[PDB]
Amino acid sequence: ALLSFERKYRVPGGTLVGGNLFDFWVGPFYVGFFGVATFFFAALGIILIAWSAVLQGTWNPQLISVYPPALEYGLGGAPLAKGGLWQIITICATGAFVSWALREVEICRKLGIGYHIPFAFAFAILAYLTLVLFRPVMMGAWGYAFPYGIWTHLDWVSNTGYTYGNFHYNPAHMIAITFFFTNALALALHGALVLSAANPEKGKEMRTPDHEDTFFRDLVGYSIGTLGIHRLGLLLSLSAVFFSALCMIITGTIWFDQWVDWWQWWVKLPWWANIPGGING
């Protein structure tokens, strides 16, 4: 099963590891060395999680959860139902994600395209590794990490958030959100634009990229351009996830207090702070 055009591209090579050995396909999926690694890290990782579901006495994805070793075990090892599992699973996870990105690099090489995609993936892996690794190791316990389970990790969020107060007051978090909120606006536009032009009014001819630039200049008085909007949403996206990891790495480490209180540095600047009137006067 290939696509009508697929066969010409299916030449050998591009592999980082192993030469011709794993270089071949299964269905649409390319394999490669790292296709196998991914499988193995994902296989193992699922099995552990499956076997961590027994110790808790449920198969209910809603219920199932794998908690990190408690603050007492620190950065050391822990018994399996005691949070050792989570630790290996994280190894399996971090493995299967990185095996994934590298498999994506091997696909880039066969298709003679740029590495932009698995570069961008790495920003999501880094957010994750912040949460399960960089933050915990800076804080000295694997228990500070989020647990793996559908709602139970969302519990982790609301608890970790409110530890610091209303979390909205984390400035790096405000920045991260502004990117997330923008990017979605930039996705909505980019899609709506390209579609409007390929699907114009009834009976009309397909519009042109010139109509695209026009519509926006007509609208907000500027158009970033088609090479632009792609750089844009890619930036707005990686930006968003960068400040997300940033907002969380400073939290608990260089700032453990109530985030709203952080903003006093501004209020308490000398050339205003004691002037009567206002909110904080």
Binding site: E104, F180, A188, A197, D210, G221, T226, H230, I275
Partner: protein, 302 residues
């Protein structure tokens, strides 16, 4: 050092682009603004021209009246002292009328009738601006996609300060204009309703937001990977498929076992994005009207 196409290597400039004409009225379209070599390195360098009509001015007016009406009050709180103004800037707020005033306009200015004023100004400014996103497209004879996608964002915005406060019987349920204040309203809303995380629409709203960031990261990166085959010119790959379109589809097929089309991907785009504020608008609208507590609801409904 292999060149990655994130920043323009060599800019060129040529005659200011006045743009396509079609059915547009050119009497309402301004002249070209400057060319930013700065912008150039990323997107286009050309500012303008911008179309400004009877509706474009209406919008542009109210939107400022909305922005002033707030800051006038923000000065009032500062006691007209610029040092305090600047300092307390995030702490200022213009707040909705007290619940005792219900849905009326009777509420005095310092009690939030000044809120209503700015809010009206907003309402006018936004729809009039939505007027533009349909009309500018009509004029060029393109699809209304931008108008519909915008409507999706308007949804949540209408729910927030308009539709919901009407269904709850008072304006006090609405959102205050201020930087830290509306942040609190958000957080306060969570508590009042039993941890908004238990609203299955926030569940989805967050997924689409997350997915919007994931997909535009994929899409954007992808087009940049195939840009060496001129991938960015999407429309003419739609009419005539380039190796760019094939190499794109094939990366994803080989990775995830399926793939998109160069027109198709944009439908994934417009939707994934739209659904953030689409779902999320419902989630709010249902809160306090129907479901008072999302934890409670979550125990009796799945």
């Amino acid at each position: 050092a292999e060149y990655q196409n994130i920043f323009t290597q060599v800019q060129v400039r040529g005659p200011a682009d006045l743009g396509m004409t079609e059915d547009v009225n050119l009497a309402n379209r301004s002249g070209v603004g400057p060319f930013s070599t700065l912008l150039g390195w990323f997107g286009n360098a050309q500012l303008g021209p911008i179309y400004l009509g009877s509706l474009g001015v209406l919008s542009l007016f109210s939107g400022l009246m909305w922005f002033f009406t707030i800051g006038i009050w923000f000065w009032y709180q500062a006691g007209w002292n610029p040092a305090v103004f600047l300092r307390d800037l995030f702490f200022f707020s213009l707040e909705p009328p007290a619940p005792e005033y219900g849905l009326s306009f009777a509420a005095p200015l310092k009690e939030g009738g000044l809120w209503l004023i700015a809010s009206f100004f907003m309402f006018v400014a936004v729809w009039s601006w939505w007027g533009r996103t349909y009309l500018r497209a009509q004029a060029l004879g393109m699809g209304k996609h931008t108008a519909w996608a915008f409507l999706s964002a308007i949804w949540l915005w209408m729910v927030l300060g308009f539709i919901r406060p009407i269904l709850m019987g008072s304006w006090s349920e609405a959102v205050p204009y201020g930087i830290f204040s509306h942040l609190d309203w958000t957080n306060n809303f969570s508590l009042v309703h039993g941890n908004h995380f238990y609203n299955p629409f926030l569940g989805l709203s967050i997924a689409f937001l997350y997915g919007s960031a994931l997909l535009f990261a994929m899409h954007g990166a992808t087009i940049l990977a195939v840009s060496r085959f001129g991938g960015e010119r999407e429309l003419e790959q739609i009419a005539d498929r380039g190796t760019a379109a094939e190499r794109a589809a094939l990366f994803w097929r080989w990775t995830m076992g399926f793939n998109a089309t160069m027109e198709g991907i944009h439908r994934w785009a417009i939707w994934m994005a739209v659904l953030v504020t689409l779902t999320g608008g419902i989630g709010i609208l249902l809160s306090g009207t129907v479901v008072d507590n999302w934890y409670v609801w979550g125990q009796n409904h799945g």
